[PDB]
Design a protein around this ligand. Structure first.
Ligand code: HEM
Ligand code: HEM
Lengths: 197, 15, 197, 14
């Protein structure tokens, strides 16, 4: 099996080689990555980072960006996951198919985030903060990224303040998701390396 | 070490 | 070489077995770990958490707490690292005994954190915030941990706003250190694994 | 799957 919901189905043909499975996987997740790229070009300060930092922020923040965007793919009430093809699989189904604790963590993250029911403006501004908050370890001009990060955060607070005048705490709740997304990312690369069993 | 590295080729190609 | 400044020294006697090298090392870091435990017992609402969640917060967050208490081991002006023995070593020294990006990432972090010029009190509350922010994978009462975190965060914002009135932005910066600390934790864990393989 | 050299020191105190 391949239980990543970027798949179009967790079901893998047992009679296809590893690289042909992976290529099928790829023509499913490749569009979603390209939309993170497109989305980055539309963050205005982003185009003003060097080419190297732009690529590095995307290399490191794409997963986090997607976890935010596709959090809606985790139905906490139905206890189902929607895969990219559109089909839904129960949690119980996926656990017997190989899934474990990262799936449960993603449901808890998604439940709490879907709970906020952010609009698309709030979300798109949130995701951009998530992108330029990517781990900085390969970044050359850290100060300029932290200045873009700082600018995008200020817009987030202003937008939240106008949209939730009586609920200021949403803003801090959104920031405190950043370490949660970073743990989901680590565990999820650990899942990727375990691809070698 | 290996992470979202299978994503590298898609990002560089839009650059 | 054992280039972790929790060591007494980065020099390892080569006529020593792995298990006794680790014995001496553990002699050096175990007091700092035990001190985290005693700090935790002093954070206002920590002891009211279930026993299991206290332990799982300290299992996952001790490193990030220590990375904050020991940020002064990293002197940016001198490019030296002070080991727990008190001996000082230069980055170039450590780079040739095996150190790399994680060491540099840590100097960057210490530089940014010392820049915020916080009082001890603000530091001890930020560190409580850090601990209760630990990865939530093994946590059984998520809302109680996040209620403790949200109240510590709020307490911290009031103290930072009162003491740095020329700069409320120090609170946001502090918040954005939580994904940084999480990334250092993941980098450092990987270095730890590597030392074992 | 690690960094749990710290467990023993922490679980002892409880
Ligand atoms: C292009 C980006 C991604 C690639 C190449 C990728 C690849 C993979 C692979 C190979 C696995 C292991 C599958 C298995 O062991 O059966 C996996 C696991 C998983 N991935 Fe992804 N993934 C990507 C992005 C994402 C995103 C954005 C999400 C969530 C929105 C996600 C959610 C999951 C989940 C829930 C699992 C299973 C966790 C568990 O076993 O508990 N992945 N991924
Ligand atoms: C009890 C807690 C800790 C243990 C058991 C531990 C263990 C280790 C081990 C085994 C290594 C690999 C050393 C090598 O390959 O030579 C390492 C690396 C390192 N650790 Fe720790 N560590 C701990 C906490 C910390 C803390 C709190 C800090 C910072 C304040 C830190 C800073 C470093 C650095 C800078 C390196 C080298 C990074 C590099 O190679 O670039 N460690 N640690």
């Amino acid at each position: 099996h391949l239980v990543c919901p970027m798949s179009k189905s967790p079901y893998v043909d047992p009679h296809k080689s590893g690289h042909e499975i992976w290529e099928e996987f790829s023509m499913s997740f490749t569009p979603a990555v390209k939309e993170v790229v497109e989305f980055a070009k539309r963050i205005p300060g982003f185009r003003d980072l060097s080419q190297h930092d732009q690529v590095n922020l995307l290399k490191a923040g794409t997963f986090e960006v997607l976890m935010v965007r596709f959090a809606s793919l985790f139905d906490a009430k139905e206890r189902t996951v929607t895969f990219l093809s559109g089909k839904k699989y129960s949690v119980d189904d996926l656990h017997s198919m190989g899934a474990g604790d990262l799936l449960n963590s993603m449901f808890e993250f998604s439940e709490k985030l879907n709970a906020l029911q952010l609009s698309d403006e709030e979300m798109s501004l949130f995701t951009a903060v998530v992108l330029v908050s990517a781990d900085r370890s390969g970044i050359e001009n850290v100060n300029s990224v932290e200045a873009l990060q700082e600018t995008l955060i200020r817009a987030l607070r202003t937008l939240i303040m106008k949209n939730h005048p009586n609920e200021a705490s949403i803003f801090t709740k959104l920031l405190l998701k950043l370490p949660d997304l970073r743990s989901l990312n680590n565990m999820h690369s650990e899942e990727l390396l375990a691809f070698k069993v | 070490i290996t992470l979202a590295d299978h994503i590298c080729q898609i990002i560089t190609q839009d650059f």
